[PDB]
Design a protein around this ligand. Structure first.
Ligand SMILES: Nc1ncnc2c1ncn2[C@@H]1O[C@H](COP(=O)(O)OP(=O)(O)OP(O)(O)=S)[C@@H](O)[C@H]1O
Ligand SMILES: Nc1ncnc2c1ncn2[C@@H]1O[C@H](COP(=O)(O)OP(=O)(O)OP(O)(O)=S)[C@@H](O)[C@H]1O
Ligand SMILES: Nc1ncnc2c1ncn2[C@@H]1O[C@H](COP(=O)(O)OP(=O)(O)OP(O)(O)=S)[C@@H](O)[C@H]1O
Ligand SMILES: Nc1ncnc2c1ncn2[C@@H]1O[C@H](COP(=O)(O)OP(=O)(O)O)[C@@H](O)[C@H]1O
Ligand SMILES: [Mg+2]
Ligand SMILES: [Mg+2]
Ligand SMILES: [Mg+2]
Lengths: 349, 330, 316, 286, 328
């Protein structure tokens, strides 16, 4: 398996990148009977899902990591048969309503309502009494599945509990946030990522030459542990079980494509350059990369150019904010992704 | 047992704090039988659902409720078809005969109540198909609409429904309830606490009771028998520490775009919410006396625009960086 | 309980009593006498005589066989492809008509028909063109498919002028011996806006309410067309007067904000003496206000803000 | 229990329910409870109304202990009753004793099915009441015809098979025993006519009056223009009719009276269209 | 019976005498009824102005005991698709009225919610059976009705209720409930209604419930403002004066104190300030534009929620900004 999964912490005592948060999780799990609904928010890849699974182990004992997949099908308002993968555990449940699209409403109103209606009592029943359902990517719920959750998890909370993992809580409506306990998961420092990578290379044979390259991995990952371990394995496979200080820090292909787009924008500012930028943006979108991420990375690559003055960067960030707001309240992403670029190269000239 | 929010839910109308302008009217309804159609609107976690459930319990009782109450929320389909058949049929139903126990213990008004919670999520056609359903069967059926944004309720429906605004629960009107919960849950706190909880929870008692529950859980876990301090509740809420805010504003005072860019980049890794930091910046910049009128006039609009953009579900790194850059160039 | 409304009581029964479209009406009378009436599509706006002319044409043409000759179908009747497959037996029917006369199939409101029905109507119009003729009457000619318009002679009815409205009003008045004055009839025509039916209805209402058709009595029960008040509001010089109109003549009169926004959109589309950039900016502002109104904020402050933005983009 | 009725001849109430189906199949039904018997009333679009009546003699027990009011009115949906009795008639060959019950306003309509081993009990929810204005004037009858059930049922079936978008009725009795009664239809075939015979076994009595039900005259005919959508609502009731009585007044109301063999009495009131008259006369003089 | 009904439904007019405010239309329809000819009517106006009441009372003075067999009332609570128009309305219109009260009446309440296909099909039912039936159309939004339908219907506009009509009806309600209302309370009620009878009746019912002794106890303006939760005029004037003259900190403190004194919301304060601003004698004409634009944006944002403390500061900043161009 991958080094992100093979070395995944499988308990609350195995966490080693945030201790205040681990103490808080232990405090929550000491008395599991009055556990409220929890909303874990923080940067991507900090270990929010790992912390949730550790908490579920701590509350329901070992038994929560034995996942198996259930195929569950619905039908939209019209006769549109739909499928959703449901990975389930003897003590908890996990679904990703965002994977089905704008029709997560039927999923929330049928699957979750059915599980919340069942009492789970087994001959006069914390452990296999209430149920825990994990909503992965709670940000992508389309402002309506969050409305169907306001009463589902407030009326049937005696036999079900909700713990949702979301990076950021801007797209989550106020009523949903009000009913839940907010748990913040800060990103680990570079020293902690270096320590984790050192442990991995100690249990592995990557044959490090200097422990200042693990620091380079940590700095290049921008606080993302999954990405850090992915680069570690990448270099420790392309460069053999050997990591020299000359080894190349591997970055995702879409990132370097966005950097090339940035350099093209800075160099060439003309209508034909705009059309080629559109072609590259279409190629990026053809890989199912979300448009907000494309805009964010493009903006933060444009702000990294050393040949731009402060006024150009301020204009770039203002246009980025305006077009991010437009993208949020929009249907087609290409219009806004093109408008941002057009304004950028109309300002740099 | 159960979360303190689902354990201290008001059971009668006398447990509903801070809303007397509406609870008094609903209590006067008990002796009479002229309950009008009600439109409950207000900020989240203000007690609308609790108030209506308490009123229903006091009017009917556990036995007659199952026959004289219909509750429809956003968790179930409420399209035009459902509105035109199911709600209409329930409104057309005859009032069930109350039992002798019910008549001798409860007022048992000669009508039923249809509770449409989260009515703001209903479409305009569904709300239009309600007007004559309420008007024609007003004498045998009553309607209660619960919503957070009154603008999402169409004007014709808002005209026929009596409007009851539920006030925001601040530290001046909900301190007694939180104190009661604390003394009944044996929660020890310093002076100033249980007021900072209500200040952080802007007009929301549900969150001001969940925060207190989490603080008590942690305090019981640590096991030193010491009170809960303001720092602990603040940290648990998600409030940015004052030192980080001071560093942010010093970087803003500097003006350098790349310094601000890197501080924001390292700040977004901490996971702090953009809304909370924006609110703290608002408090700092408006209540200070070191800034001129023009500075405050411009920054109020800047913070307003940033908050409006954040409420729409946008990237917080782009919005926070833009707000700080703008504040650095005023 | 025995009187019929003046709209139906005075509906013309002969082609000579149909005011307006002088040339078109003369052509229709010539077709009535000569015969050999072609397939026709009669378009135009409401209240001009598109159905009072097709029915009169069918009457004066078929005459005594107006019962076995005129198959009238309209939106109130089912007109699916199945019906078009009632329209086939009627066409196949043989009736001994005078020379030059043909059966008429009056499909009133042909713009609301389904496209399958039209694709079958083409078959019927192609196989049975020598015995029966089709007279489509609609409000927008584009709703009839091009293959059907190809086989038909398009006759477009223009808006009725003030003189053809005044002449018919004078006829109806002389028949109803009501009292009037010149200003009252001018106001009735002004509020009619090229509609004969609306003019008749307004005259009937004024006579019933008061009896004397003067300006005051007409205007106290019939309101001046609000599209014109919207146009007056949008062309104001300073914002004071524009907001003043918006309030007094549109808000306190009971008009809904959404109605004002839609009327403003149409007025801007048809506005004159305004630059294209200004027109498109006003269209954008009106669209934003429409969005705000549809989302729930149906307040007078939104309309005031829209007028302020329009003035701001006008003065610069 | 303010009302209680027991019977074992469930086929009678089954035919009563199947005679109420033509008047829409998912809507409200009015049930009038009085000392004389049990009556179901249905109305459609304010243009046609049916009124079946189950007499006290059809039940061994019929209490009606209600004293405050002489008659009791309740409104229950018909789809619920149909869907229930449909699955209850699965084992109808068993000796079932139906028991109707009603405890007053606010109480459900009970329908107990006991087989001496299983006692199924159903409580139908009663709805608010929105049906007499649709009644012919008894002093204004223009024609009164008594027709046999089988002949009328056959004529209605034929008119259904011909389509019969619109229908016409004729009632002329000439100087001699020339009782003419016909059912003309405006159908795809064109102008079709079904003429009832003048013999006394099919047409027992035809009498045409001058709108007063007292003065009989010959040589004049009363014409009724009816929509066959409403006219087909009596076909399912004529299927079990021994004799059918037709009455119409000058206000344009046709009152079909159906008697079954004691059995069940069915009263249907039908409204006349606005309105071909000369075509009718010319076709029947021909 | 009629004593356990809401005041909005208990005080529904039964005859055209009791419909106030709308005088011209009532006079015209009374003359139409007496003359015996009734055209196809269309009633237009704001909600709660008395359209349904007017048409129902007219159809009770036109029919009587047969108001249930001569009038077919269809509204938004009923399906009104193409099939409904083609079958139910067509069969009601074609049939005869048993000669009762001449023509039959069809009332289409809330016709603005009807689909365009149904309205287009109704055109040839309105003008074919006009000899037997008369159609009435009730709508609040005229843009949702086809122009052809508007052409064949006589348009009567129901204006917002004037002050005099509200005063008369409030007096009727008071006498029928044995209540006392001060002149200032009546002013406040008639002003908060915005030409709505239903709002008046609901607020009066809440006022009666608020009073300890519904009889012997008067409804002052304070009671009205407490029950309806609206700012007092003095509160709005004080907030505005603090914003205009005092500094930023004092203005912020005064706004917060005013809102916390009685739990006042921000949207009602915004509206109250907006009216006073509308009255002002501005001399720059960009003050007005900035005020309207900024306050409309703030109101829309409030309509979608957010930080209620950021929005108050936004309001203060918008006012100060706009009223700095006045001195320019
Ligand atoms: N006035 C009050 N007195 C006591 N508890 C209250 C009050 N208002 C709210 N609460 C508490 O707030 C929690 C939730 O209140 P609810 O009224 O059910 O939520 P809400 O008002 O419907 O907000 P929504 O559903 O998001 S619109 C419960 O634990 C209540 O005990
Ligand atoms: N040219 C005309 N001269 C006199 N009266 C007319 C004329 N056109 C229409 N009318 C009157 O309008 C009414 C009949 O309306 P129509 O002519 O059928 O309207 P229309 O042109 O068919 O518009 P649509 O398509 O039905 S909305 C009667 O009251 C007529 O007297
Ligand atoms: N002119 C009036 N005089 C007295 N009471 C009135 C008047 N207008 C309205 N009301 C009251 O307000 C209630 C609602 O008015 P309605 O006439 O039923 O509805 P409406 O005015 O047609 O508004 P919509 O468009 O139907 S929401 C009535 O039941 C009356 O109690
Ligand atoms: N405390 C930890 N110790 C070691 N590895 C960790 C720790 N926390 C997270 N990780 C690593 O990070 C990877 C991804 O974490 P993940 O659960 O995806 O975070 P998020 O839920 O925020 O995306 C896991 O494969 C895990 O190995
Ligand atoms: Mg609620
Ligand atoms: Mg026409
Ligand atoms: Mg109404």
């Amino acid at each position: 398996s991958l080094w992100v999964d093979k070395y995944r912490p499988k308990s609350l005592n195995a966490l080693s990148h945030n201790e205040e948060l681990t103490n808080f999780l232990k405090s929550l799990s000491d008395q599991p009977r009055d556990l409220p609904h929890l909303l874990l928010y923080g940067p991507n890849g900090t270990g929010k899902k790992t912390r949730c699974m550790a908490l579920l182990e701590s509350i329901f004992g070992p038994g929560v990591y034995r996942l198996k997949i259930d195929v569950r099908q619905f039908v939209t308002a019209s006769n549109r048969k739909l499928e959703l993968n449901v990975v389930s555990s003897p003590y908890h449940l996990e679904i990703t309503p965002s994977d089905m699209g704008n029709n997560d409403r039927i999923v929330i109103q049928e699957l979750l309502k059915e599980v919340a209606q069942m009492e789970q009592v087994d001959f006069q029943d914390l452990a296999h009494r209430y149920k825990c359902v994990i909503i992965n990517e709670a940000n992508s719920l389309t402002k309506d599945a969050q409305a169907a959750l306001r009463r589902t998890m407030e009326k049937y909370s005696k036999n079900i509990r909700l713990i949702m993992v979301c990076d950021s809580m801007s797209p989550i409506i106020a009523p949903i946030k009000s009913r839940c306990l907010l748990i913040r998961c800060p990103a680990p420092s570079d020293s902690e990522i270096s320590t984790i990578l050192s442990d991995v290379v100690t249990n592995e044979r990557i044959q490090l030459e200097t422990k200042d390259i693990l620091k380079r991995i940590a700095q290049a990952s921008n606080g993302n542990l999954r990405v850090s371990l992915l680069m570690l394995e990448s270099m420790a496979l392309n460069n053999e079980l050997a990591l020299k200080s000359s080894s190349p820090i591997i970055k995702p292909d879409w990132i370097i494509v966005i950097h090339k787009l940035t350099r093209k924008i800075v160099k060439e500012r003309s209508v034909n350059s705009l059309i080629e930028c559109r072609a590259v943006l279409y190629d990026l979108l053809a890989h199912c990369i979300p448009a907000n991420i494309i805009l964010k990375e493009l903006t933060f690559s444009l702000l990294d150019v050393e040949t731009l003055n402060t006024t150009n960067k301020s204009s770039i960030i203002e246009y980025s904010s305006v077009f991010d707001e437009r993208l949020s309240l929009g249907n087609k992403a290409i219009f806004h992704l093109e408008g941002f670029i057009a304004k950028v190269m109309c300002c740099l000239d | 047992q159960q979360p303190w929010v689902e354990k201290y839910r008001p059971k009668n109308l006398d447990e509903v704090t801070a809303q007397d302008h509406a609870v008094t009217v609903l209590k006067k309804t008990l002796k009479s039988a002229n309950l009008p159609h009600m439109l409950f609107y207000g900020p989240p976690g203000t007690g609308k659902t609790s108030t209506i459930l308490a009123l229903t319990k006091e009017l009917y009782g556990p036995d007659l409720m199952k026959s004289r109450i219909l509750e429809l929320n956003a968790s179930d389909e409420r399209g035009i078809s459902i509105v035109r058949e199911k709600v209409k049929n329930f409104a057309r139903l005859t009032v069930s005969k109350p039992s002798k126990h019910d008549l001798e213990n409860y007022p048992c008004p000669p009508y039923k109540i249809i509770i449409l919670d989260e009515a703001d999520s209903m479409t305009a056609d569904a709300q239009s198909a309600l007007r004559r359903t309420m008007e024609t069967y007003s004498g045998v059926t009553r309607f209660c609409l619960i919503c957070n944004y009154v603008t999402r309720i169409i004007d014709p429906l808002a005209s026929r429904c009596s409007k009851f605004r539920f006030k925001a629960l601040d530290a001046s009107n909900a301190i007694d309830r939180l104190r009661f919960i604390s003394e009944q849950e044996n929660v020890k706190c310093d002076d100033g606490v249980l007021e900072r909880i209500l200040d952080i929870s802007a007009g929301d008692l549900r969150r001001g009771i969940t925060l207190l529950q989490s603080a008590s859980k942690g305090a019981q876990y640590l096991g030193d028998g010491k009170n809960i301090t303001s720092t602990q509740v603040e940290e648990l809420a998600g409030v940015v520490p004052h030192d980080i805010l001071i560093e942010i504003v010093e970087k803003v005072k500097s003006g350098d775009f790349d310094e601000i860019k890197k501080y924001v980049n390292t700040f977004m890794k901490s996971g702090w919410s953009a809304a909370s930091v924006v609110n703290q910046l608002h408090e700092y910049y408006i209540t200070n006396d070191n800034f001129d009128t023009n500075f405050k006039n411009q920054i109020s609009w800047l913070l307003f625009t940033t908050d409006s953009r954040l409420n729409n579900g946008t990237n917080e790194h782009i919005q926070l960086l833009n707000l700080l850059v703008k504040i650095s160039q005023l | 309980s025995l009187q019929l409304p003046w709209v139906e009581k005075y509906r013309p029964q002969v082609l000579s009593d149909i005011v307006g479209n002088k040339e078109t009406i003369d052509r229709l009378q010539q077709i009535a006498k000569d015969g050999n009436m072609p397939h026709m599509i009669i378009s135009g706006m409401p209240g001009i005589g598109k159905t009072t002319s097709v029915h009169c044409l069918a009457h004066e043409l078929l005459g005594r066989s107006y019962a076995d000759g005129v198959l009238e179908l309209n939106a109130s009747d089912d007109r699916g492809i199945d019906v078009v497959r009632q329209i086939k037996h009627f066409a196949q029917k043989k009736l001994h008509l005078p020379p030059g006369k043909h059966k008429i199939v009056i499909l009133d409101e042909a713009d609301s028909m389904t496209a399958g029905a039209q694709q079958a109507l083409r078959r019927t119009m192609e196989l049975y063109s020598n015995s029966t003729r089709f007279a489509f009457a609609c409000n927008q000619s584009n709703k009839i498919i091009e293959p059907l318009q190809s086989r038909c002679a398009i006759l477009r009815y223009s808006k009725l002028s003030d003189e053809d409205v005044l002449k018919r009003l004078l006829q109806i008045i002389k028949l109803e011996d009501v009292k009037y004055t010149n200003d009252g009839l001018e106001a009735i025509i002004f509020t009619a806006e090229g509609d004969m039916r609306q003019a008749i209805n307004n005259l009937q209402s004024t006579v019933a309410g008061h009896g004397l058709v003067n300006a005051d009595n007409v205007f106290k029960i019939v309101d001046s067309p609000h599209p014109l008040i919207v146009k007056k509001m949008l062309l104001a010089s300073n914002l004071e007067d524009s907001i003043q109109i918006l309030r007094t003549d549109l808000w306190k009169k009971g008009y809904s904000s959404i109605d004002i926004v839609t009327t403003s959109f149409r007025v801007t589309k048809n506005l004159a003496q305004v630059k294209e950039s200004v027109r498109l900016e006003m269209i954008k502002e009106i669209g934003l206000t429409h969005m705000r109104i549809l989302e729930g904020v149906g307040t007078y402050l939104q309309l005031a803000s829209m007028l302020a933005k329009i003035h701001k983009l006008n003065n610069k | 229990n303010k009302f209680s009725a027991s019977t074992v001849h469930l086929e009678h109430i089954t035919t009563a329910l199947s005679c109420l189906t033509p008047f829409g199949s998912k809507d409200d039904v009015l049930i009038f409870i009085d000392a004389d018997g049990l009556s179901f009333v249905r109305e459609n679009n304010h243009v046609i109304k049916i009124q079946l009546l189950l007499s006290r003699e059809l039940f061994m027990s019929y209490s009606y202990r209600n004293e405050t009011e002489d008659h009791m009115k309740l409104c229950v949906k018909i789809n619920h009753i149909l869907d229930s009795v449909s699955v209850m008639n699965r084992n109808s060959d068993d000796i079932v004793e139906c028991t109707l019950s009603y405890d007053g306003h606010g109480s459900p309509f009970v329908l107990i099915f006991e087989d001496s081993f299983i006692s199924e009990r159903v409580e139908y929810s009663t709805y608010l009441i929105k049906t007499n204005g649709l009644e012919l004037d008894r002093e204004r009858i223009s024609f009164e015809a008594i027709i046999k059930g089988e002949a009328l049922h056959s004529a209605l079936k034929d008119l259904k098979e011909i389509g019969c978008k619109e229908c016409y009725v004729y009632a002329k009795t000439e100087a001699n025993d020339e009782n003419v009664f016909a059912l003309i239809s405006k159908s795809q075939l064109g102008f079709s006519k079904i003429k009832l015979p003048s013999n006394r076994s099919i047409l027992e009595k035809l009498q045409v009056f001058d709108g007063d039900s007292t003065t009989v005259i010959d040589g004049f005919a009363v014409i009724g223009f009816f929509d066959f959508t409403s006219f087909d609502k009596i076909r399912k009731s004529t299927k079990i009719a021994s004799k059918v009585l037709f009455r119409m007044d000058v206000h344009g109301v046709l009152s079909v009276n159906i008697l079954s063999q004691p059995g069940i009495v069915i009263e249907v009131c039908m409204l006349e269209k606005e309105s071909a008259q000369t075509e009718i006369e010319l076709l029947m003089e021909t | 019976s009629k004593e356990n009904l809401p005041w909005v439904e208990k005080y529904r007019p039964e005859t055209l005498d009791e419909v106030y405010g709308q005088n011209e239309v009532i006079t015209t329809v009374r003359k139409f009824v007496d003359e015996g000819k009734l055209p196809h009517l269309l009633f237009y106006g704001p909600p709660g102005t008395g359209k349904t009441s007017t048409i129902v009372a007219l159809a009770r003075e036109i029919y009587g005991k047969n108001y249930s067999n001569m009038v077919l009332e269809l509204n938004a609570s009923d399906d009104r698709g193409i099939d409904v128009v083609r079958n139910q309305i067509k069969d009601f219109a074609s049939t005869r009225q048993i000669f009762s009260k001449g023509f039959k009446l069809i009332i289409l309440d809330e016709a603005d919610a009807m689909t365009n296909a149904a309205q287009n099909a109704l055109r040839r039912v309105i003008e074919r059976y006009t000899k037997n039936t008369r159609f009435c159309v009730l709508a609040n939004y005229a843009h949702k009705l086809t122009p052809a339908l508007l052409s064949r219907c006589t348009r009567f506009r129901f204006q917002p209720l004037p002050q005099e009509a509200i005063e008369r009806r409030i007096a009727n309600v008071l006498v029928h409930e044995k209540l006392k209302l001060s002149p200032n309370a009546e002013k406040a009620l008639i002003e908060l209604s915005n030409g709505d009878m239903r709002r008046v009746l609901n607020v009066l019912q809440s006022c009666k419930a608020t009073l300890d002794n519904p009889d012997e106890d008067e409804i002052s303006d304070d009671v009205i403002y407490e029950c309806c939760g609206a700012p007092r005029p003095s509160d709005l004037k004080a907030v505005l004066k603090s914003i205009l003259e005092d500094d930023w900190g004092t203005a912020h403190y005064t706004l917060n104190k005013v809102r916390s004194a009685k739990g006042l919301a921000l949207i009602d304060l915004i509206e109250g300030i907006v009216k006073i601003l509308e009255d002002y004698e501005l001399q720059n004409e960009e003050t007005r534009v900035h005020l309207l634009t900024k306050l409309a944006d703030i109101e829309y944002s409030i309509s979608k929620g957010g930080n209620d403390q950021i929005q108050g500061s936004a309001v203060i900043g918008a006012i100060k900004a706009s009223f700095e161009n006045e001195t320019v």
